Tab-separated table of C-alpha atoms and ligand atoms in Angstrom:
chain	number	residue	atom	x	y	z
A	1	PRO	CA	8.931	-37.716	-6.064
A	2	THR	CA	8.443	-34.494	-3.925
A	3	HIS	CA	11.796	-33.417	-2.249
A	4	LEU	CA	15.474	-33.946	-3.338
A	5	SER	CA	16.783	-37.208	-1.708
A	6	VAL	CA	19.934	-36.404	0.368
A	7	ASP	CA	21.246	-39.733	-1.122
A	8	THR	CA	21.245	-38.147	-4.641
A	9	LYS	CA	24.761	-37.800	-6.146
A	10	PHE	CA	26.332	-34.331	-6.268
A	11	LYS	CA	29.013	-33.734	-8.951
A	12	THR	CA	32.095	-32.267	-7.150
A	13	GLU	CA	34.224	-31.263	-10.185
A	14	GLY	CA	33.181	-27.547	-9.802
A	15	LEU	CA	34.296	-27.769	-6.090
A	16	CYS	CA	37.828	-29.143	-6.580
A	17	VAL	CA	39.853	-25.854	-6.987
A	18	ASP	CA	38.579	-24.368	-3.671
A	19	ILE	CA	38.475	-27.941	-2.162
A	20	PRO	CA	41.374	-29.985	-3.627
A	21	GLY	CA	41.047	-33.788	-3.173
A	22	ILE	CA	37.239	-33.728	-2.846
A	23	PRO	CA	35.841	-37.237	-3.524
A	24	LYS	CA	34.326	-37.682	-7.030
A	25	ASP	CA	31.648	-39.870	-5.323
A	26	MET	CA	29.561	-37.524	-3.115
A	27	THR	CA	25.882	-37.368	-1.908
A	28	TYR	CA	23.957	-34.320	-0.607
A	29	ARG	CA	24.119	-36.103	2.827
A	30	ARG	CA	27.962	-36.142	2.778
A	31	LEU	CA	28.130	-32.575	1.277
A	32	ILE	CA	25.809	-31.062	3.976
A	33	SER	CA	27.943	-32.862	6.620
A	34	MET	CA	31.149	-31.478	5.007
A	35	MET	CA	29.526	-27.968	5.111
A	36	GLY	CA	29.383	-28.409	8.958
A	37	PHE	CA	25.569	-29.023	9.361
A	38	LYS	CA	23.836	-32.073	10.960
A	39	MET	CA	20.335	-33.244	9.808
A	40	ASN	CA	20.003	-35.705	12.829
A	41	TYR	CA	17.839	-38.197	10.711
A	42	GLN	CA	15.139	-35.466	11.177
A	43	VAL	CA	11.593	-35.903	9.720
A	44	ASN	CA	10.523	-32.274	10.567
A	45	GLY	CA	9.648	-30.637	7.173
A	46	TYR	CA	13.332	-29.838	6.192
A	47	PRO	CA	14.678	-33.073	4.578
A	48	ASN	CA	17.413	-31.348	2.475
A	49	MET	CA	19.118	-27.894	2.363
A	50	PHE	CA	19.227	-28.465	-1.453
A	51	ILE	CA	16.100	-28.629	-3.664
A	52	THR	CA	15.004	-29.858	-7.113
A	53	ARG	CA	14.757	-27.540	-10.186
A	54	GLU	CA	10.909	-28.056	-10.025
A	55	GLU	CA	10.886	-26.963	-6.328
A	56	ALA	CA	13.174	-23.952	-7.178
A	57	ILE	CA	10.805	-22.980	-10.065
A	58	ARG	CA	7.788	-23.005	-7.675
A	59	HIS	CA	9.940	-20.709	-5.366
A	60	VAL	CA	11.411	-18.295	-8.043
A	61	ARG	CA	10.333	-15.272	-5.876
A	62	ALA	CA	12.785	-16.603	-3.216
A	63	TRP	CA	15.839	-16.745	-5.601
A	64	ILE	CA	18.973	-14.857	-4.373
A	65	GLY	CA	22.139	-15.446	-6.396
A	66	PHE	CA	25.041	-15.998	-3.984
A	67	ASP	CA	28.798	-16.137	-4.703
A	68	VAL	CA	31.929	-16.007	-2.471
A	69	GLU	CA	35.468	-15.131	-3.698
A	70	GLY	CA	38.845	-15.577	-1.923
A	71	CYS	CA	40.070	-11.964	-1.267
A	72	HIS	CA	43.712	-13.116	-0.588
A	73	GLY	CA	39.230	-19.836	3.842
A	74	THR	CA	39.938	-19.040	7.585
A	75	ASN	CA	43.476	-17.779	6.648
A	76	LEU	CA	42.105	-14.995	4.352
A	77	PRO	CA	39.212	-12.498	3.921
A	78	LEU	CA	36.100	-13.510	1.845
A	79	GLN	CA	33.931	-11.331	-0.474
A	80	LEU	CA	30.210	-12.343	-0.145
A	81	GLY	CA	28.185	-11.250	-3.198
A	82	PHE	CA	24.365	-11.307	-3.522
A	83	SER	CA	22.183	-10.746	-6.661
A	84	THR	CA	20.871	-7.672	-4.728
A	85	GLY	CA	24.208	-6.044	-5.891
A	86	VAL	CA	25.654	-6.167	-2.309
A	87	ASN	CA	29.292	-7.222	-1.583
A	88	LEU	CA	30.262	-7.826	2.108
A	89	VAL	CA	33.874	-8.607	3.160
A	90	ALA	CA	34.057	-11.085	6.117
A	91	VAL	CA	37.429	-11.418	7.993
A	92	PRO	CA	38.062	-14.414	10.287
A	93	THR	CA	39.987	-12.041	12.697
A	94	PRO	CA	27.779	-2.586	-7.145
A	95	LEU	CA	27.797	-1.806	-3.331
A	96	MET	CA	31.298	-2.600	-1.854
A	97	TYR	CA	31.739	-2.699	2.032
A	98	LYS	CA	35.050	-2.832	4.062
A	99	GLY	CA	36.263	-5.963	5.990
A	100	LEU	CA	34.340	-6.959	9.189
A	101	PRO	CA	34.008	-10.062	11.419
A	102	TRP	CA	31.292	-12.676	10.789
A	103	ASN	CA	29.355	-11.746	13.976
A	104	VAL	CA	28.507	-8.325	12.375
A	105	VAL	CA	28.406	-9.556	8.693
A	106	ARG	CA	25.646	-12.103	9.641
A	107	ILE	CA	23.360	-9.260	11.041
A	108	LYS	CA	23.692	-7.395	7.682
A	109	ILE	CA	22.861	-10.644	5.775
A	110	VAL	CA	19.543	-11.097	7.756
A	111	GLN	CA	18.524	-7.364	7.393
A	112	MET	CA	19.288	-7.463	3.613
A	113	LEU	CA	17.380	-10.759	2.916
A	114	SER	CA	14.424	-9.746	5.175
A	115	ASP	CA	14.028	-6.372	3.312
A	116	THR	CA	14.384	-8.029	-0.146
A	117	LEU	CA	12.139	-11.031	0.543
A	118	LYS	CA	9.412	-10.097	3.087
A	119	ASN	CA	6.914	-9.006	0.322
A	120	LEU	CA	8.041	-11.776	-2.122
A	121	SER	CA	8.305	-15.147	-0.326
A	122	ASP	CA	8.088	-17.312	2.854
A	123	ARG	CA	11.778	-18.427	2.226
A	124	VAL	CA	15.196	-17.859	0.541
A	125	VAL	CA	16.671	-20.047	-2.256
A	126	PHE	CA	20.441	-19.338	-2.629
A	127	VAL	CA	21.193	-19.787	-6.355
A	128	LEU	CA	24.834	-21.003	-6.662
A	129	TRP	CA	27.483	-21.760	-9.253
A	130	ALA	CA	29.263	-23.683	-6.520
A	131	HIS	CA	33.095	-23.705	-6.451
A	132	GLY	CA	33.356	-24.350	-2.659
A	133	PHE	CA	33.977	-21.166	-0.582
A	134	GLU	CA	30.214	-20.318	-0.842
A	135	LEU	CA	29.188	-23.706	0.663
A	136	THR	CA	31.893	-23.657	3.404
A	137	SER	CA	30.900	-20.063	4.407
A	138	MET	CA	27.260	-20.997	5.174
A	139	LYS	CA	28.068	-22.362	8.685
A	140	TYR	CA	29.015	-18.777	9.665
A	141	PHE	CA	25.541	-17.202	8.946
A	142	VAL	CA	23.097	-20.219	8.665
A	143	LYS	CA	21.367	-22.385	11.334
A	144	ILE	CA	19.127	-25.364	10.425
A	145	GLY	CA	16.684	-27.447	12.458
A	146	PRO	CA	13.000	-28.373	12.357
A	147	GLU	CA	10.520	-26.122	10.479
A	148	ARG	CA	9.263	-23.439	12.957
A	149	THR	CA	6.775	-20.527	13.039
A	150	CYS	CA	7.617	-16.828	13.662
A	151	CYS	CA	7.598	-15.843	17.400
A	152	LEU	CA	5.264	-12.839	16.514
A	153	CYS	CA	3.087	-14.401	13.673
A	154	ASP	CA	1.968	-17.606	11.848
A	155	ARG	CA	4.490	-17.411	8.937
A	156	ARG	CA	7.322	-20.002	8.788
A	157	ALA	CA	10.578	-18.888	10.536
A	158	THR	CA	13.384	-17.685	8.157
A	159	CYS	CA	15.713	-16.138	10.841
A	160	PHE	CA	17.064	-16.959	14.342
A	161	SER	CA	18.449	-14.676	17.114
A	162	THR	CA	21.261	-15.977	19.414
A	163	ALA	CA	20.528	-12.953	21.717
A	164	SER	CA	16.876	-13.836	22.506
A	165	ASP	CA	16.954	-17.563	21.459
A	166	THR	CA	13.848	-17.003	19.213
A	167	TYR	CA	12.752	-17.391	15.559
A	168	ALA	CA	11.167	-14.815	13.195
A	169	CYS	CA	9.802	-14.597	9.620
A	170	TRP	CA	11.194	-11.938	7.167
A	171	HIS	CA	8.652	-9.328	8.534
A	172	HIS	CA	9.760	-9.712	12.246
A	173	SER	CA	13.542	-10.287	11.970
A	174	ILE	CA	14.942	-6.882	13.099
A	175	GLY	CA	18.105	-7.452	15.229
A	176	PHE	CA	18.205	-11.215	14.241
A	177	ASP	CA	21.696	-12.637	13.418
A	178	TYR	CA	21.145	-16.044	11.664
A	179	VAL	CA	19.410	-17.193	8.445
A	180	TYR	CA	17.305	-20.211	9.455
A	181	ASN	CA	16.471	-23.200	7.172
A	182	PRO	CA	17.497	-21.557	3.877
A	183	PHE	CA	17.285	-23.522	0.579
A	184	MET	CA	19.904	-23.622	-2.173
A	185	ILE	CA	20.432	-25.045	-5.695
A	186	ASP	CA	23.821	-25.488	-7.495
A	187	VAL	CA	23.176	-24.492	-11.166
A	188	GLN	CA	26.425	-26.333	-12.086
A	189	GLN	CA	24.590	-29.680	-11.318
A	190	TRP	CA	22.417	-29.067	-14.427
A	191	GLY	CA	25.269	-30.094	-16.746
A	192	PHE	CA	27.027	-27.212	-18.531
A	193	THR	CA	30.422	-26.976	-20.339
A	194	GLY	CA	32.781	-24.106	-19.456
A	195	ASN	CA	32.498	-21.429	-16.792
A	196	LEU	CA	29.632	-19.175	-15.547
A	197	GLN	CA	30.498	-16.119	-17.727
A	198	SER	CA	30.837	-18.168	-20.972
A	199	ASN	CA	27.376	-19.763	-20.315
A	200	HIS	CA	25.634	-16.557	-19.078
A	201	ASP	CA	26.984	-14.419	-21.995
A	202	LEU	CA	25.422	-16.874	-24.544
A	203	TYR	CA	22.004	-15.419	-23.469
A	204	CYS	CA	22.549	-11.963	-21.918
A	205	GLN	CA	24.466	-8.737	-22.867
A	206	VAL	CA	23.069	-6.677	-19.928
A	207	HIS	CA	25.048	-8.130	-16.955
A	208	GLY	CA	28.812	-7.408	-17.289
A	209	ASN	CA	31.563	-9.143	-15.263
A	210	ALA	CA	33.339	-6.588	-13.021
A	211	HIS	CA	35.260	-9.611	-11.492
A	212	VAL	CA	33.420	-9.076	-8.131
A	213	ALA	CA	31.260	-11.521	-6.140
A	214	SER	CA	27.877	-9.708	-6.654
A	215	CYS	CA	28.414	-9.795	-10.511
A	216	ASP	CA	28.764	-13.636	-10.480
A	217	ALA	CA	25.725	-13.799	-8.077
A	218	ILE	CA	23.663	-11.744	-10.621
A	219	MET	CA	24.930	-13.817	-13.643
A	220	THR	CA	24.139	-17.072	-11.705
A	221	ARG	CA	20.457	-16.049	-11.042
A	222	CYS	CA	20.207	-14.694	-14.679
A	223	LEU	CA	21.415	-18.035	-16.149
A	224	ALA	CA	18.985	-19.910	-13.807
A	225	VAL	CA	16.058	-17.679	-14.920
A	226	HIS	CA	17.078	-18.176	-18.592
A	227	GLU	CA	17.047	-22.007	-18.144
A	228	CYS	CA	13.769	-22.279	-16.173
A	229	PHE	CA	11.641	-19.423	-17.693
A	230	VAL	CA	13.015	-18.464	-21.207
A	231	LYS	CA	14.158	-21.697	-22.964
A	232	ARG	CA	11.821	-23.823	-20.733
A	233	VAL	CA	8.296	-22.369	-19.972
A	234	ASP	CA	5.581	-23.882	-17.676
A	235	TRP	CA	2.245	-21.918	-17.535
A	236	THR	CA	0.576	-24.725	-15.453
A	237	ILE	CA	2.609	-23.739	-12.314
A	238	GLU	CA	0.450	-21.464	-10.060
A	239	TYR	CA	2.089	-18.860	-7.729
A	240	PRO	CA	0.486	-17.532	-4.490
A	241	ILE	CA	-1.296	-14.095	-4.303
A	242	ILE	CA	1.269	-11.696	-2.631
A	243	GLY	CA	-0.190	-8.281	-3.688
A	244	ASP	CA	-2.765	-6.658	-6.023
A	245	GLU	CA	-2.841	-9.562	-8.552
A	246	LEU	CA	-6.679	-9.823	-8.617
A	247	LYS	CA	-7.358	-6.035	-8.839
A	248	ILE	CA	-4.678	-5.621	-11.625
A	249	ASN	CA	-6.164	-8.538	-13.652
A	250	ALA	CA	-9.736	-7.118	-13.245
A	251	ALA	CA	-8.402	-3.668	-14.189
A	252	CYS	CA	-6.726	-5.104	-17.351
A	253	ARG	CA	-10.090	-6.607	-18.462
A	254	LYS	CA	-11.989	-3.298	-17.768
A	255	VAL	CA	-9.417	-1.153	-19.683
A	256	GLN	CA	-9.284	-3.621	-22.596
A	257	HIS	CA	-13.114	-3.586	-23.081
A	258	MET	CA	-13.145	0.260	-22.666
A	259	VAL	CA	-10.351	1.038	-25.188
A	260	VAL	CA	-11.362	-1.431	-27.947
A	261	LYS	CA	-15.078	-0.570	-27.540
A	262	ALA	CA	-14.142	3.135	-28.007
A	263	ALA	CA	-11.804	2.599	-31.040
A	264	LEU	CA	-14.559	0.575	-32.820
A	265	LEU	CA	-17.181	3.367	-32.101
A	266	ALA	CA	-14.753	6.213	-33.017
A	267	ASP	CA	-13.272	4.801	-36.314
A	268	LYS	CA	-15.880	2.042	-37.178
A	269	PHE	CA	-13.289	-0.530	-38.430
A	270	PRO	CA	-15.044	-3.304	-40.441
A	271	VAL	CA	-12.524	-5.983	-39.234
A	272	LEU	CA	-10.427	-6.447	-36.040
A	273	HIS	CA	-7.311	-8.772	-36.052
A	274	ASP	CA	-6.866	-10.078	-32.466
A	275	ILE	CA	-3.206	-11.317	-32.318
A	276	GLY	CA	-1.937	-13.191	-29.239
A	277	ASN	CA	-3.249	-15.563	-26.598
A	278	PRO	CA	-4.898	-18.598	-28.275
A	279	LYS	CA	-7.288	-18.746	-25.213
A	280	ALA	CA	-8.356	-15.077	-25.950
A	281	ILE	CA	-12.121	-14.203	-26.009
A	282	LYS	CA	-13.880	-11.215	-27.762
A	283	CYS	CA	-13.268	-8.257	-25.322
A	284	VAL	CA	-16.291	-6.337	-26.885
A	285	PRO	CA	-18.811	-9.142	-27.570
A	286	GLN	CA	-21.583	-6.704	-28.728
A	287	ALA	CA	-19.442	-4.868	-31.404
A	288	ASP	CA	-20.609	-5.153	-35.083
A	289	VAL	CA	-17.095	-5.886	-36.491
A	290	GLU	CA	-15.551	-8.991	-38.173
A	291	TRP	CA	-13.451	-10.444	-35.267
A	292	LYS	CA	-10.572	-12.674	-36.619
A	293	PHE	CA	-8.202	-14.319	-34.057
A	294	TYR	CA	-4.518	-15.240	-34.578
A	295	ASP	CA	-2.724	-17.610	-32.116
A	296	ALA	CA	0.563	-16.493	-30.535
A	297	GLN	CA	1.851	-17.672	-27.149
A	298	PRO	CA	3.546	-15.057	-24.939
A	299	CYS	CA	7.143	-14.793	-26.343
A	300	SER	CA	9.439	-15.301	-23.303
A	301	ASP	CA	12.752	-14.750	-25.210
A	302	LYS	CA	12.830	-12.184	-28.102
A	303	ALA	CA	9.848	-10.034	-29.219
A	304	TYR	CA	8.051	-11.571	-32.253
A	305	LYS	CA	9.026	-10.173	-35.683
A	306	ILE	CA	5.935	-8.599	-37.355
A	307	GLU	CA	7.347	-10.135	-40.633
A	308	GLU	CA	6.895	-13.708	-39.265
A	309	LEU	CA	3.439	-13.004	-37.608
A	310	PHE	CA	1.917	-11.407	-40.788
A	311	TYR	CA	3.880	-12.479	-43.930
A	312	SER	CA	4.264	-16.068	-45.123
A	313	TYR	CA	0.895	-14.998	-46.692
A	314	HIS	CA	-5.878	-14.997	-42.225
A	315	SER	CA	-7.759	-11.957	-43.520
A	316	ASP	CA	-4.228	-11.809	-45.107
A	317	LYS	CA	-4.962	-8.003	-45.286
A	318	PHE	CA	-3.931	-7.023	-41.679
A	319	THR	CA	-3.840	-3.443	-43.190
A	320	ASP	CA	-7.723	-3.623	-43.314
A	321	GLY	CA	-9.411	-2.472	-40.051
A	322	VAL	CA	-7.419	-2.583	-36.786
A	323	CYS	CA	-4.897	-4.938	-35.121
A	324	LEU	CA	-5.256	-5.668	-31.367
A	325	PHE	CA	-1.954	-6.702	-29.671
A	326	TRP	CA	-3.009	-7.246	-26.022
A	327	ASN	CA	0.287	-8.333	-24.331
A	328	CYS	CA	1.553	-9.738	-27.674
A	329	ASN	CA	5.130	-8.281	-27.784
A	330	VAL	CA	6.379	-7.558	-31.346
A	331	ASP	CA	9.503	-5.725	-32.602
A	332	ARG	CA	7.475	-2.998	-34.484
A	333	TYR	CA	3.648	-2.565	-34.395
A	334	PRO	CA	1.861	-1.590	-37.596
A	335	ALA	CA	0.253	1.943	-37.686
A	336	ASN	CA	-3.343	0.477	-37.438
A	337	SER	CA	-2.828	-1.089	-33.920
A	338	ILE	CA	-4.272	-1.018	-30.370
A	339	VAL	CA	-1.482	-2.220	-27.996
A	340	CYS	CA	-1.020	-3.190	-24.353
A	341	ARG	CA	2.749	-3.779	-23.704
A	342	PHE	CA	4.289	-4.695	-20.288
A	343	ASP	CA	7.132	-2.306	-19.351
A	344	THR	CA	9.853	-4.636	-17.960
A	345	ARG	CA	11.594	-1.648	-16.181
A	346	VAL	CA	8.694	-1.278	-13.620
A	347	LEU	CA	9.666	-1.776	-9.901
A	348	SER	CA	7.029	-4.006	-8.155
A	349	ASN	CA	6.657	-7.158	-5.991
A	350	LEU	CA	5.196	-8.997	-9.057
A	351	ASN	CA	8.081	-8.089	-11.447
A	352	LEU	CA	11.395	-9.933	-10.831
A	353	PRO	CA	14.642	-9.024	-12.662
A	354	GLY	CA	15.072	-11.214	-15.750
A	355	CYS	CA	17.492	-12.209	-18.559
A	356	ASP	CA	18.949	-9.792	-21.177
A	357	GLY	CA	16.933	-6.725	-19.977
A	358	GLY	CA	13.671	-8.738	-19.825
A	359	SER	CA	11.794	-9.210	-16.529
A	360	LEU	CA	9.991	-12.152	-14.898
A	361	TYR	CA	6.398	-11.006	-14.256
A	362	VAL	CA	4.800	-13.373	-11.722
A	363	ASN	CA	0.993	-12.957	-11.363
A	364	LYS	CA	-0.761	-16.357	-10.897
A	365	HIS	CA	1.706	-17.681	-13.632
A	366	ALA	CA	5.363	-16.692	-14.411
A	367	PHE	CA	5.833	-14.823	-17.772
A	368	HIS	CA	9.455	-13.984	-18.705
A	369	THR	CA	8.962	-10.776	-20.828
A	370	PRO	CA	11.458	-9.429	-23.400
A	371	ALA	CA	13.049	-5.997	-22.613
A	372	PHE	CA	10.734	-2.966	-23.130
A	373	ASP	CA	11.753	-1.148	-26.377
A	374	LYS	CA	10.274	2.359	-27.145
A	375	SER	CA	11.173	1.894	-30.886
A	376	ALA	CA	8.412	-0.827	-31.094
A	377	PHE	CA	5.835	2.029	-30.881
A	378	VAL	CA	7.198	4.439	-33.613
A	379	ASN	CA	3.999	4.060	-35.749
A	380	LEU	CA	1.706	4.736	-32.731
A	381	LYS	CA	1.123	7.276	-29.936
A	382	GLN	CA	0.466	6.809	-26.217
A	383	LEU	CA	-3.276	6.268	-25.583
A	384	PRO	CA	-4.567	9.126	-23.383
A	385	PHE	CA	-6.768	8.288	-20.310
A	386	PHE	CA	-10.546	8.575	-20.923
A	387	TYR	CA	-13.810	7.016	-19.659
A	388	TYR	CA	-16.648	6.299	-22.172
A	389	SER	CA	-20.188	5.075	-21.369
A	390	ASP	CA	-23.465	4.907	-23.333
A	391	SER	CA	-25.118	3.334	-20.213
A	392	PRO	CA	-28.220	5.251	-19.000
A	393	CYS	CA	-27.789	7.969	-16.304
A	394	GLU	CA	-29.426	6.028	-13.456
A	395	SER	CA	-28.137	5.523	-9.841
A	396	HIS	CA	-29.769	2.449	-8.065
A	397	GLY	CA	-28.902	0.767	-4.715
A	398	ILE	CA	-20.973	5.860	-2.319
A	399	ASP	CA	-20.488	9.429	-0.859
A	400	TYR	CA	-20.134	12.352	-3.298
A	401	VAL	CA	-18.377	15.470	-4.632
A	402	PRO	CA	-19.803	16.389	-8.110
A	403	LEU	CA	-17.382	15.296	-10.898
A	404	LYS	CA	-16.030	17.741	-13.490
A	405	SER	CA	-13.768	16.140	-16.181
A	406	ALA	CA	-13.147	16.838	-19.898
A	407	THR	CA	-12.388	13.017	-20.119
A	408	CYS	CA	-15.781	11.672	-18.793
A	409	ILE	CA	-17.365	10.917	-22.204
A	410	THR	CA	-21.104	10.477	-21.348
A	411	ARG	CA	-24.559	11.896	-22.434
A	412	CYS	CA	-24.721	13.717	-19.037
A	413	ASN	CA	-21.333	15.470	-19.579
A	414	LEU	CA	-22.434	16.329	-23.161
A	415	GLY	CA	-25.513	17.837	-21.381
A	416	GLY	CA	-23.132	19.919	-19.145
A	417	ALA	CA	-23.591	18.079	-15.727
A	418	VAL	CA	-22.159	14.538	-14.959
A	419	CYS	CA	-24.850	12.293	-13.256
A	420	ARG	CA	-23.979	10.470	-9.936
A	421	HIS	CA	-23.932	6.981	-11.636
A	422	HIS	CA	-21.381	8.047	-14.336
A	423	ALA	CA	-19.330	9.954	-11.666
A	424	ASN	CA	-19.038	6.747	-9.510
A	425	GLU	CA	-18.211	4.618	-12.604
A	426	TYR	CA	-15.700	7.251	-13.863
A	427	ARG	CA	-13.903	7.199	-10.481
A	428	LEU	CA	-13.823	3.353	-10.294
A	429	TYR	CA	-12.466	3.167	-13.897
A	430	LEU	CA	-9.759	5.811	-13.227
A	431	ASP	CA	-8.665	3.763	-10.109
A	432	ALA	CA	-8.557	0.535	-12.214
A	433	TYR	CA	-6.628	2.375	-14.984
A	434	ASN	CA	-4.107	3.791	-12.420
A	435	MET	CA	-3.698	0.275	-10.878
A	436	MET	CA	-2.861	-1.265	-14.303
A	437	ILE	CA	-0.425	1.548	-15.271
A	438	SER	CA	1.361	1.430	-11.895
A	439	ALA	CA	1.635	-2.418	-12.370
A	440	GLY	CA	3.758	-1.546	-15.505
A	441	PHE	CA	1.310	-1.922	-18.464
A	442	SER	CA	1.586	0.795	-21.165
A	443	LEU	CA	-1.149	1.532	-23.797
A	444	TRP	CA	-0.519	2.690	-27.391
A	445	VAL	CA	-2.921	3.474	-30.268
A	446	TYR	CA	-3.057	4.417	-33.980
A	447	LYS	CA	-2.277	8.180	-34.416
A	448	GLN	CA	-5.801	9.075	-35.804
A	449	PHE	CA	-7.462	7.937	-32.498
A	450	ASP	CA	-9.448	10.961	-31.187
A	451	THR	CA	-11.955	10.821	-28.248
A	452	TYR	CA	-13.681	13.873	-29.864
A	453	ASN	CA	-15.199	11.291	-32.293
A	454	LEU	CA	-17.075	9.510	-29.385
A	455	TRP	CA	-19.349	12.512	-28.516
A	456	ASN	CA	-21.614	11.945	-31.628
A	457	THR	CA	-22.257	8.251	-30.574
A	458	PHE	CA	-25.056	9.932	-28.550
A	459	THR	CA	-27.066	12.863	-30.168
B	1	LIG	C1	-14.931	-5.939	-18.008
B	1	LIG	O1	-15.136	-7.024	-18.910
B	1	LIG	C2	-16.137	-6.958	-19.851
B	1	LIG	C3	-17.317	-6.236	-19.708
B	1	LIG	C4	-18.270	-6.248	-20.714
B	1	LIG	C5	-18.069	-6.981	-21.865
B	1	LIG	C6	-16.901	-7.724	-22.025
B	1	LIG	C7	-15.927	-7.712	-21.031
B	1	LIG	N1	-14.761	-8.428	-21.167
B	1	LIG	C8	-13.444	-7.772	-21.052
B	1	LIG	C9	-12.363	-8.435	-21.871
B	1	LIG	N2	-12.382	-9.885	-21.655
B	1	LIG	C10	-11.221	-10.573	-22.206
B	1	LIG	C11	-10.520	-11.322	-21.152
B	1	LIG	N3	-10.127	-11.853	-20.188
B	1	LIG	C12	-13.655	-10.417	-22.149
B	1	LIG	C13	-14.799	-9.890	-21.318
B	2	LIG	ZN1	6.417	-13.058	11.751
B	3	LIG	ZN1	22.317	-11.690	-17.383
B	4	LIG	ZN1	-24.786	10.008	-16.732
């Protein structure tokens, strides 16, 4: 039950306008053969160019929408479009490049995939809405064979050079001319009615059709993400560490404790309404307050409506005390809220482009997140950076410039000189805070929140 059997049937109806007369009865084995590749009855870690939905989902970071359009098949020029927004024209002799032979076009394809993918994935998965020219163009830029390692490192080989006769990963591929052992999935096999645009546009108003190859490539990946991450959701699937995942997650826990601890001290709310993850734990276990939890899974599609979360009749009175929405995305937060909200527009290795302005945030698990909307925050203000500690001034166990900051809220700074302990802790917390913000989290708070109110929590 692991890999896609090459003896699985492939539905050819999508193929029959580029490839008239194609047999209705078709396996992966016969299709790969028709595409001009030979798998040589090879048991060497590459059983099929094509993969299961499940396998594609585990390799979402590798997804590159790919589409080819007839420009006038060997007679005529082809437009190659990638979900990176690139269009290359290959002659057989939004970025839009003039007509060039395959021997140069293939170099550009390797450079482009290597730069997109080297910090994302060990592979490429070409996401297709297959009509035929895309599959019959692969022979011109793809080589297959046994699984190999990079010539300069231990990573699996993703590229081949005809010049040097060697194999490279995405990091070591400069001057390489062939994509090696790519994977691919035809979204049209999943059983849809009507064309790509009609199916995409059911779910997404953000990706237009300019009637160019890259636009279909983008719509194809978008539809695929919608199907595997919006309508369907699987939070069991783990994803490898590729960047600052652990630091960001640690940072998110340190900021959450800091901000909620401070709001309770500053405004002394008698009740806190903790709305979101049903696994959620008290972030300030020592606080006096009545802590009431409300279960909401991460909304992958549309932001929750505050009307459905709160009304239908709890403490019932959510207007009493404060509401904590820690990555619980709602259309409009009430005035008495503390909020962490992921900004889908952030550029990072963890954040993949998503469906209808939303983004696919992949950090241990994959969370499709609805488009960031500034109007959600009209009743709140941005939470300013600050560090608060009531811990004793007391070193123990670090090289130093003395800290001066208006935003180091400690007994020692009240006293006019920040102690070494609170200086070290301030600097660690500011680093954590910067990490979290740079990762794309944004923090919002009730308008009355004032750090001036924390100074009297020591006297
Ligand atoms: C830095 O973490 C703490 C330090 C002191 C007390 C509590 C916590 N937390 C943070 C929030 N966390 C929720 C989650 N995950 C519960 C435990
Ligand atoms: Zn390498
Ligand atoms: Zn879309
Ligand atoms: Zn101190």
